[PDB]
Amino acid sequence: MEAVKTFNSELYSLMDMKPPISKAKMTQITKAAIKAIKFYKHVVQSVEKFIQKCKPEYKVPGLYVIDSIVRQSRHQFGQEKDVFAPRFSNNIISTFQNLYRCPGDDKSKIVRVLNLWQKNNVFKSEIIQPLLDMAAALEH
């Protein structure tokens, strides 16, 4: 899976940079993911694996990868044709459990993304709400 090998390289190249990650790098990763759309399942697994394994400082970068991929795919293939949001939604509870192990000052950045996802209907509201509830429950 050459296209996946190229995606894996871009995603892991996040390790070669101190956050915040540039738009230029996020674009590169996103472009690689889209070119690898035949193996969208392996792309999703690689992103989820990255989020499970990375240092606290790369949690929000990991979430930005999901955001950037999903929005680019919706734009490029059509909102109802996008394969990425539905696939990312399968393990999304586990993904956010992992994301919420970010530094304290990064929690608001996760909520910001969740609110935008709701506002712009990137994910179904039924999916997003428990993710928000988890954020608030952590603050108590």
Partner: peptide, 9 residues
């Protein structure tokens, strides 16, 4: 410029 989740695709 750093990535913003508000920025267009």
């Amino acid at each position: 410029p750093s990535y913003s989740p508000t920025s267009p695709s």
